[PDB]
Design a protein around this ligand. Structure first.
Ligand SMILES: C[C@H](CO)OC[C@@H](C)OC[C@H](C)OC[C@@H](C)O
Ligand SMILES: C[C@H](CO)OC[C@@H](C)OC[C@H](C)OC[C@@H](C)O
Ligand SMILES: C[C@H](CO)OC[C@@H](C)OC[C@H](C)OC[C@@H](C)O
Length: 583
């Protein structure tokens, strides 16, 4: 009834600016290939209707579900079948099947042109119309990242406004803007891959998967909070995420504000670090809570062995409520160990489960489970050795070299995967050395495992849409928690049948010389994957040889008088020599 006017409710809660930015973000994530101009028209239609409903909630159609009015507007796009083909058959369904149908067509890899920041243009547009400028930013990020966490995206537009405000008054605009745009881009991609994982985890493993993970993570952040408080916040947070992942962006933002306000209302029970956040306006306040540091572990917490090893009544407590007991173990263990990664803590709780499953059936269980922490130690040693061996590799070779060593590893593990994905994934895995290796001791394992989760999740998303490795299938779907170690344990796929040498990847036109350093690296790393797809067992000496000849060749032609001529006429020599080197 009254609150059947969901659209009026949302508009009242969020205010017009946020309402519109959220509706814009929604259209952009569902119809990633429509122009801004079109999306602005749809947002204005729905805002105008919301305003009619606010004035009068009994107006016709004002009682429809917000998500229904929104799906109806999507279906009312004339080019819908021309552009999105099958997507239009979504329209023939009732909700919530219609939406689940639309969501299915969200495109994780839409391959839209690269935005190349032209600072003077950016600044002319920003000066012309600040509000259109920000809209075009939301649209452009949102269409590229159809699962971006919508309220954070509103936040980024507000935050970076100060950028343009200061930078666009300067004469040397590009010196001011370009470093900041780079940093903006960094946060955005980080944020995107994080939200992508939250959505994949809900969709492929269930809401409970994301809850477990959140319980670990918040217990580290708010180690003084009570289990029941963590539980309340995680559930409310998981609803917010499920809503954003399902395209319910207004309800998602509305629920998040409520959560931010609840966390500020109760900060004394939660963390003293929250004081910084709580006098801020709503988007910054939520951002600031999402980013707050771990509070200090309180004094006087009993040793974990008191409740979970020494205690003679573990088996009783576990059999009486298996799930609460493990949840509680997870909370207790997480609060005391901010230095452990979330997934390591989840792996610890699973192994603990396994142990009690075995131990409680036994004659005398207490003797069996009392040494459980000795059993668990390997789950902490292995991530540690991973980090140790990889960080020395990274520092021995630097980022690009480290990327190249993972190119070799990953092509072997998953040779069926497409070369652009193996290059993209391997370059990100190597950047995990750049982001994590130099961090403090108590940050290295959380940082390493968290970025590995984000990048393997990106591999799983791409792969699940066009499956070509049974092994990558296995590691993606068998267990969210064991993804990283499942991937880590892969050896050369002995099932794989080598492809013939693909020469095009070792032959070039003159415009290779003109490429940015990154694109040049990508060309080389692409060649590298191709070497291995052809000869997965090539020796390091062969690979270095080929790649040294490759760089040598490009140098030589790029320095020629006739570049094209040297590439085309000499190019067959690199091909010939490369093959001779693989004999
Ligand atoms: C579609 C329409 C532009 O005409 O809305 C986009 C606009 C309201 O952006 C909202 C976003 C939160 O703005 C950024 C801040 C700094 O104004
Ligand atoms: C209001 C604001 C929403 O993003 O609060 C978030 C805060 C409670 O924690 C975010 C934290 C990093 O958990 C994310 C996990 C669930 O992947
Ligand atoms: C909210 C809930 C307990 O009430 O916490 C999640 C609980 C099932 O964690 C147990 C354990 C970590 O599960 C291992 C799986 C989810 O990876």
């Amino acid at each position: 009834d009254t609150h059947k006017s969901e659209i009026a409710h949302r508009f009242n809660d969020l205010g017009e600016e946020n309402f519109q930015g959220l509706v814009l973000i929604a259209f952009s994530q569902y119809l990633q290939q429509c122009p801004f101009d079109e999306h602005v028209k749809l947002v204005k239609e729905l805002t105008e209707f919301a305003k009619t409903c606010v004035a009068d909630e009994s107006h016709a159609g004002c009682d429809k579900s917000l998500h229904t009015l929104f799906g109806d507007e999507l279906c009312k796009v004339a080019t819908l079948r021309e552009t999105y083909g099958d997507m239009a058959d979504c329209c023939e369904k009732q909700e919530p099947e219609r939406n689940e149908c639309f969501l299915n067509h969200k495109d994780d890899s839409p391959d839209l042109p690269k935005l190349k920041p032209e600072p003077d243009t950016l600044c002319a547009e920003f000066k012309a119309d600040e509000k259109k400028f920000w809209g075009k930013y939301l649209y452009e990020v949102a269409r590229r990242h159809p699962y971006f966490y919508a309220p954070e995206l509103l936040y980024y537009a507000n935050k970076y406004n100060g950028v343009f405000q200061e930078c666009c008054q300067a004469e040397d605009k590009g010196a001011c803007l370009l470093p900041k745009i780079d940093a903006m881009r960094e946060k955005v991609l980080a944020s995107s891959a994080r939200q992508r994982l939250r959505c994949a985890s809900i969709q492929k493993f269930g809401e409970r998967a994301l809850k477990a993970w959140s319980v670990a993570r918040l217990s580290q952040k708010f180690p003084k909070a009570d289990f029941t408080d963590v539980t309340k916040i995680v559930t409310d947070l998981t609803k917010v995420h499920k809503e954003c992942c399902h395209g319910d962006l207004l309800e998602c933002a509305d629920d998040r504000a409520d959560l931010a306000k609840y966390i500020c209302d109760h900060q004394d029970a939660l963390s003293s670090k929250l004081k910084e956040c709580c006098d801020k306006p709503v988007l910054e306040k939520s951002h600031c809570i999402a980013e707050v540091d771990k509070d200090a572990v309180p004094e006087n917490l009993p040793p974990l062995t008191a409740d979970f090893a020494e205690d003679k009544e573990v088996c009783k407590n576990y059999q009486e409520a298996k799930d609460v007991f493990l949840g509680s173990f997870l909370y207790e263990y997480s609060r005391r160990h901010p230095e452990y990664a979330v997934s390591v803590l989840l792996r610890l709780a699973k192994e603990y489960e396994a142990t009690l499953e075995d131990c409680c059936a036994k004659e005398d269980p207490h003797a069996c489970y009392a040494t459980v922490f000795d059993k668990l130690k390997h789950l902490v040693d292995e991530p540690q050795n991973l980090i140790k061996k990889n960080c020395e590799l990274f520092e021995k070779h630097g980022e690009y070299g480290f990327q190249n060593a993972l190119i070799v590893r990953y092509t072997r593990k998953a040779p069926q995967v497409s070369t652009p994905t193996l290059v993209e994934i391997s370059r990100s895995l190597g950047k995990v050395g750049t982001k994590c290796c130099a961090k403090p001791e108590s940050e290295r394992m959380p940082c390493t495992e968290d970025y590995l989760s984000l990048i393997l999740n990106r591999l799983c998303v791409l792969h699940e849409k066009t499956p070509v490795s049974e092994k990558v299938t296995k590691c993606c779907t068998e267990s969210l928690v064991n993804r990283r170690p499942c991937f880590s344990d892969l050896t050369l796929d002995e099932t794989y049948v080598p492809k013939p040498f693909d020469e095009k990847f070792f032959t070039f036109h003159a415009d290779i010389c003109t490429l940015p350093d990154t694109e040049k690296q990508i060309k080389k790393q692409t060649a590298l994957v191709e070497l291995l797809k052809h000869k997965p067992k090539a020796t390091d000496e062969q690979l270095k040889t080929v790649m040294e000849n490759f760089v040598a060749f490009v140098d030589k032609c790029c320095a020629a008088d006739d570049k094209e001529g040297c590439f085309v006429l000499e190019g067959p020599k690199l091909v010939a020599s490369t093959q001779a080197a693989l004999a």
